[PDB]
Design a protein around this ligand. Sequence first.
Ligand SMILES: Nc1nc2c(ncn2[C@@H]2O[C@H](COP(=O)(O)OP(=O)(O)OP(=O)(O)O)[C@@H](O)[C@H]2O)c(=O)[nH]1
Ligand SMILES: Nc1nc2c(ncn2[C@@H]2O[C@H](COP(=O)(O)OP(=O)(O)OP(=O)(O)O)[C@@H](O)[C@H]2O)c(=O)[nH]1
Ligand SMILES: Nc1nc2c(ncn2[C@@H]2O[C@H](COP(=O)(O)OP(=O)(O)OP(=O)(O)O)[C@@H](O)[C@H]2O)c(=O)[nH]1
Ligand SMILES: Nc1nc2c(ncn2[C@@H]2O[C@H](COP(=O)(O)OP(=O)(O)OP(=O)(O)O)[C@@H](O)[C@H]2O)c(=O)[nH]1
Ligand SMILES: [Fe+3]
Ligand SMILES: [Fe+3]
Ligand SMILES: [Fe+3]
Ligand SMILES: [Fe+3]
Lengths: 438, 439, 440, 439
Amino acid sequence: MKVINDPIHGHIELHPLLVRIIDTPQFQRLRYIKQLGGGYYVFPGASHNRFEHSLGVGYLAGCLVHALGEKQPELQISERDVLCVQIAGLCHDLGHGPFSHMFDGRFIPLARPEVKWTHEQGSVMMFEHLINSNGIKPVMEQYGLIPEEDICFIKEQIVGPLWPYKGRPENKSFLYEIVSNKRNGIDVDKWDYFARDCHHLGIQNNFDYKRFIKFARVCEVDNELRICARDKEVGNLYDMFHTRNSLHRRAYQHKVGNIIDTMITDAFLKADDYIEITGAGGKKYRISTAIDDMEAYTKLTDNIFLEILYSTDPKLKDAREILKQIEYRNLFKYVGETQPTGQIKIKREDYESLPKEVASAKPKVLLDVKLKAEDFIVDVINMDPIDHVSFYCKTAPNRAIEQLIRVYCKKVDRKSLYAARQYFVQWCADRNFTKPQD
Amino acid sequence: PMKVINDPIHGHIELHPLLVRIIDTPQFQRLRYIKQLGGGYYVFPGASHNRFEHSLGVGYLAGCLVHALGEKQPELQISERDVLCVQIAGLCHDLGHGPFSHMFDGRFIPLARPEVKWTHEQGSVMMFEHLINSNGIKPVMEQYGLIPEEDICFIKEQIVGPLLWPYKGRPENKSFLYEIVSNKRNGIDVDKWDYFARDCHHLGIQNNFDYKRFIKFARVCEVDNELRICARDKEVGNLYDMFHTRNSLHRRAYQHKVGNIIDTMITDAFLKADDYIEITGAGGKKYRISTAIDDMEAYTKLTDNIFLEILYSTDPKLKDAREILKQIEYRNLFKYVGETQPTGQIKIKREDYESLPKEVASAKPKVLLDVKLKAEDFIVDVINMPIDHVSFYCKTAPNRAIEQLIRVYCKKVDRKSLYAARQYFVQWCADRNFTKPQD
Amino acid sequence: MKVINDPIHGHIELHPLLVRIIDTPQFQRLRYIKQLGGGYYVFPGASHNRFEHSLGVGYLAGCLVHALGEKQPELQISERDVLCVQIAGLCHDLGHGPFSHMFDGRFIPLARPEVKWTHEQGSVMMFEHLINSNGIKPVMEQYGLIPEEDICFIKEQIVGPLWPYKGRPENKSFLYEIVSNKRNGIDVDKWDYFARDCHHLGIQNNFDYKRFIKFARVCEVDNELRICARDKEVGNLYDMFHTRNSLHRRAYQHKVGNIIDTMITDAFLKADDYIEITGAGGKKYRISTAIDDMEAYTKLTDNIFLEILYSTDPKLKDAREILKQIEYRNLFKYVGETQPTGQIKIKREDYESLPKEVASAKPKVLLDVKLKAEDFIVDVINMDYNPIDHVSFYCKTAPNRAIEQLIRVYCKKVDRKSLYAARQYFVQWCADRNFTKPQD
Amino acid sequence: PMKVINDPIHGHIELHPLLVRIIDTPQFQRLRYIKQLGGGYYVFPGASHNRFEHSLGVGYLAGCLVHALGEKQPELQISERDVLCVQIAGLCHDLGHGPFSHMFDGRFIPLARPEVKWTHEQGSVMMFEHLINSNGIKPVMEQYGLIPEEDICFIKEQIVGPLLWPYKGRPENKSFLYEIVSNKRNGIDVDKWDYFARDCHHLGIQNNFDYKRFIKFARVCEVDNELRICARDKEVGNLYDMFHTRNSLHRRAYQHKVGNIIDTMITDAFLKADDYIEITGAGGKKYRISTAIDDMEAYTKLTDNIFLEILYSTDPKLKDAREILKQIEYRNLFKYVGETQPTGQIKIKREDYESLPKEVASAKPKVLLDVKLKAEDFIVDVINMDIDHVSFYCKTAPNRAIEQLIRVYCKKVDRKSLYAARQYFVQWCADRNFTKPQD
Ligand SMILES: Nc1nc2c(ncn2[C@@H]2O[C@H](COP(=O)(O)OP(=O)(O)OP(=O)(O)O)[C@@H](O)[C@H]2O)c(=O)[nH]1
Ligand SMILES: Nc1nc2c(ncn2[C@@H]2O[C@H](COP(=O)(O)OP(=O)(O)OP(=O)(O)O)[C@@H](O)[C@H]2O)c(=O)[nH]1
Ligand SMILES: Nc1nc2c(ncn2[C@@H]2O[C@H](COP(=O)(O)OP(=O)(O)OP(=O)(O)O)[C@@H](O)[C@H]2O)c(=O)[nH]1
Ligand SMILES: Nc1nc2c(ncn2[C@@H]2O[C@H](COP(=O)(O)OP(=O)(O)OP(=O)(O)O)[C@@H](O)[C@H]2O)c(=O)[nH]1
Ligand SMILES: [Fe+3]
Ligand SMILES: [Fe+3]
Ligand SMILES: [Fe+3]
Ligand SMILES: [Fe+3]
């Protein structure tokens, strides 16, 4: 029964089971993986990692359940239910890779285009590895959990259904909207990293989750059980959503922030063949295939960045040279942005091909310089109002009331940069993407 | 052409292009990979911040203060040359920190090479000379009005002190400029300001000191015909809030019991790994962790990275060290035996840190005990550390002015062995004449 | 330089000029006038008076002005302007009478239908009395105020134009939206008693004025200069308006709260002839006429309730009997509520006549008992004002430019047959007055 | 039929109809016209609250606690009759307070009638009996199961104490019920809880004590085989913060310097007016302010109202008193001379308050001074203050348990007379052997 002090949430009381899950290598791994990935090289305050964030989500998961259980004893929320939601929140991010969203969103699609991989697949594999490597399942039983039944439940809360849910019956469906919510984008995962990311980026977060948790209730909608907010709390809700918008516009879509991310992945790609990560049975993996074995994956952290940078191996001199360019601030240069409006969206599978298409656009008038596909970086940003949440009133508590595409150039001179803007504008034309602004 | 960096504690920070030129180097970005609070992060989840953002802030506050004194008092003859120099000093005062900051020069080097006198402040000066040579900064200095010979002296001296008026970099009439970045006398400098605001911010402690206010009311005045930086009498209230902050950070965070236990565990791994880990320095030569300080090129490559190189290593030579770091991940820590302080004005010197376990373990405690422990089973932790010396002035007359702790840990966790450790220690305290350890 | 500790605003720093206005009898008057009138008899937490509310307004006025002056120097806002806005905030309630709104809203319309009286007229008369009785004008100039021009500005901030304004040029119009705002219902006066009234009533006030003040800016709107808010702060504004709505629904329109107000007024009416208030030149005034002399008005406070209650005077036995009714809790009984929807609103001038009308409605079928006009109390409750649309905004990208009546009737007769009789008359009176049909 | 009142501090308060019958009387509603902190309101604008809302809260808390003890411990034989009585007691414990609360019996009556022994708790008992007699409560008591003879005794005893086991109202096996409303020994009762919460709320002070929690873990247990109310050991953390609230209210509010000066000014006005004011009592007789305590019917009409009655007066017999209250409005207060304490454990008795200025004025203070002051120029303010003495229990074995300040003010405000006042006072402290005044 430890008490941890967190700068956003204050004191976080931790169930001994939770403590047993937290003091394992598969969880301490999150201490070495930046929350905002390449954010830190643009935002100096953003040194924070997945680890404390996982702590906060786990805490927020629990605050909400225990709250719903107290205001409404008829939901039959058990001490068993609160522990699983707490464990799920804690481990939803077990599967993040080097520099978080950079890894499953850009590196694996470029490194192994055929493979379908998400960090949510990654978390469940890592959670399974965690409870097996550390004999967690006996300790679950010691505190009243049913390992077969509850381990499924935690997994389904993280990666979704593997009525589709086997972990809990539908009269407890609302337990599935606590940690991550597909429908109205309101979950304790957002709350923590909304509060957390503003705190480190120097943005003001006026959203008050304690207030929202206090007035939160389960209510019936289309004969479905959902979590609802009372009508007074729409003012708080506009402040939640305005923060989500500021974080995206100001932080998550930052131009240099995202340019630098593609430089890092270009380094990991040129370095993928020459770095070995040690797995099970002593087998050796590459950076891109360590996702295939969880003990190697345990060992795949932000560390790999510095390992490349400090390397003396001549085989890694290319990968090294790109990371020296991040340190010297000689970055890739911005060419332009465009959108596939009205058009079919670019799929993760087709990322590898895009620079070849850009370099192949025929931009007549003819140009002084010619560029090959290796001089182009094509960066796909996927985006994934108030009205879509469901409310209630005190009188009737029973009843309910994109893709951006950016192109960077590795060549830094004005004559070549001009050329790049020309190819780029042509490629947009004959792909029927929107016309780039000047 | 100014770069503007957004910082959570100081906001928008405008950076002179010269400052930028210095920042975008490996000798500086190296600070992105060094925890401000070392092993603190393993006790306070918020303490993930590194020396890097802190170095930006000091550089900023330095400039803020100099520029402020210069505008209010033009007779001080503070130049753009002078301001730039003070700023670089803030920027580069932490260039020399080692893996996990103070754990490194404060415990590791004293335990690994007792013969050596090494400080991060010496290190900051070597790294700074190394920085400006490797990156052709001296032409860039000359371009913005710096005289490299004279001014490079000034920056080093603001960092490491005099290398009679001991300073060769600036005359005594500009003496006050040596009090901005690092103030030896009253411990009030813009560097403390940054890491008090910054360390409170990440730890969730309330900090009531308002430096913007303190800077706004700061003046140079004559005290014993020496020029010092002074505060208005009204602002003695703001000063007390700084010191209540210095005191709660020390009690609550930097002297935290598990925090300092974990430091020594980390340091025990670095010691047990020092011989089998190689860092490539200049001229291709190879250095060890403890001797990499002898070359700034190897030293550049020595960051928090080394904790994970040890943890992820498969080398069978490193298993002994690796196991201490795996202990930390599993949370089986060294055990607290007790705390004491050395009475009188005597303080244990850094050179004698290595001997301390030999002394504690050799103490003869009577009654004789069930177990006898070797010195290798003891960790001795030396933990080191108010208007007086501050100068004030009044609005009417602006020209003129008005510890060590020792904790001992046992590596053996068994109750019989733990009981033994407490006895040796209580004895050791006795005829070293340290104070009696309490229950 | 004084500092006052207040439970809603923390520390309130007061300019010595302000303290000089406060330490006078005309201002200390407000310590003895309940903010919520008959509220205290329904809400035990509601003991707060005009005195602390006025302080808060004065403080909040200054907070807003100083904010605008520091973020936007081109407005040319002086320390003189700040003092004037503060004094105006401070003295905007000098003219409230016994139990505040009961007095200018119901007693004077029943005691003297002929007269036009508002507490806003009252504030100016009393403010004029204050600065004259305490030799304030010499002290005003001591701190840089121009007595002639600035006393105008202050009166005008309270009671309106006496471009219509003589106190400040049109390039400083926005200074007229701080203390009281006719247009968008956003001012520092409502800000105070929204927080202050919730604090004492046990209601949650989520509105953060500090946050709103930090992002407030002056902008050009239709070639008009007004106070605007950043688009971000609509979330905060929604919570302000919800508070305004709860205070009105739950507190200011409380059914028993309003019954008790009409009783106190019934007692003041029956006592008006027999109570004498000493004015200037020693003349003696009545409750209804002390408003005609500001020296007598000063001594007219909530005190008068207890003077009636403690009386042994047989002339006041009638009044005394009603104040005994309130305390034994034998109150007037609720008969019903209705609205003048679609019809002309009942004017203050016509309040006196209404019970005669209600008692004259022919409620056929005939009833076992008959009621006289003296057995009816009709209470006209006015609440003059998406409201969120009438606010003006800006975004950081374009900082230069901008983006009812209730009628209740109570009966004094408390038996079931008479109450039933009463409902019939009331339901009829609504019928041939074309007011809404009363609900069950 | 249960009425429910919303309280800003305690939320919804459900009132037994019997309780409502008692509240809606003149003797009780009298408390709507008596400030809780009296003259405090003239120093703290938030402090406008009266005894009335406080009495409701005590009544609410009394029932809350009695009901909880009964639910966890059915063996205590706590009846619906017992609970009603404790509640009425909480409600009516403050029935006897006079104009401006503690100012009245603590200073006005001791100075106006030095011979008489009067406390408000005595007053509460008389007012309570007048209450049930004049308003026919005893038939209503019998209707809800109270036995008027036995229980009216019990209610009085909870208020003024015993009039060997001294209590006739309830047997010793129900002794603990006497510790709820007012607890003489360990200063922990629900009366204190209420005005600690309420006084914080209106003063803007932070109150960390959680009564709801403390109530949840309270139990009756045997202490020296005597029955006492106990707290669970784990929850002592809650107790320390109760006492910390008691400490801040006293340091920051109740012993406030100008607040207490003002109270003696009000008292000086009541004294200069005691003779010319008539309050009509029973049998038509006329009483003075100081003797209205002799008749409960007169006392009923004596509230804060007497203050404005004096101030608004045009009567010239009352012109002297009027001027002291006119001083208050213009803020020309009495001036502070100094503070002292009675060294030794001796306290100045209320009976001797009147003479205190006579002693001060006759002190021969050589050095001889330019001016001499008479006793009419001195105000002597006696300020009275009324953690381990609490009884605890453990979850495993629940059945069994584990000052005065004196201030002096001067009415003459000039520099020359004020200096004299300090000397007379310093001397008086000397030859009364009280401690040396500071500053
Ligand atoms: N267990 C654990 N605690 C952490 C961690 N990070 C921060 N903490 C906090 O740091 C403090 C020290 O951690 P512990 O290893 O549990 O030290 P301890 O509380 O003395 O543990 P015991 O040896 O069981 O007494 C705790 O109070 C936690 O609040 C972590 O990763 N694991
Ligand atoms: N130069 C530099 N900027 C940093 C660093 N860390 C954070 N930043 C911030 O991140 C922003 C990223 O911009 P830059 O890296 O300078 O790229 P840029 O804006 O194209 O710079 P220019 O090409 O000179 O215009 C900077 O303006 C800084 O505010 C750093 O280490 N070096
Ligand atoms: N002047 C004044 N102060 C008030 C009033 N209401 C509350 N206060 C506060 O209560 C205390 C009143 O004491 P003052 O006489 O005004 O100030 P003081 O320090 O006691 O006396 P001086 O400063 O010497 O005149 C102060 O702390 C004020 O903050 C008021 O109506 N007038
Ligand atoms: N009885 C009583 N209620 C009060 C008092 N102060 C506030 N209240 C609250 O104010 C409400 C209004 O008073 P009521 O007692 O209901 O008056 P009423 O409705 O005319 O009387 P009933 O119809 O018999 O209930 C009460 O229900 C209480 O919740 C008080 O002093 N006495
Ligand atoms: Fe997450
Ligand atoms: Fe530093
Ligand atoms: Fe107002
Ligand atoms: Fe009390």
